[PDB]
Amino acid sequence: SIRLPAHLRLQPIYWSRDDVAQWLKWAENEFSLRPIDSNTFEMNGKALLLLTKEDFRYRSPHSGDELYELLQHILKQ
């Protein structure tokens, strides 16, 4: 299953810039992804929700698609 750390259980639309960075770090560890510079997603959650999947892919060629789908899964929960 997919369970977020307590500090990230709020809806993504409320995530701060730090929350987004924490989410990226959590995802890296939970899914064994290649590390990326969190500054590639220089925004909060409300802005993150505006990005298209292609926007995720160009920011992270190696994990963007997974991160986008992970976010969709979180929203669907």
Q: Which residues bind a second copy (CB under 8 A)?
A: 2, 16-17, 30-34, 42-44, 46-47, 50-52, 55, 57-59, 62-63, 65-66, 69-70, 73
Rounded CA gap, 35 and 29, in Å?
Answer: 9
Give the up-direction half-sphere exposure of residue 14: CA atoms within 13 A in the CB hemisphere. 5
Helix, coil or strand: residue 67: helix
- For residue 66, the minimal CB distance to a second copy (Å) is 5
- For residue 6, the minimal CB distance to a second copy (Å) is 20
- For residue 23, the minimal CB distance to a second copy (Å) is 14
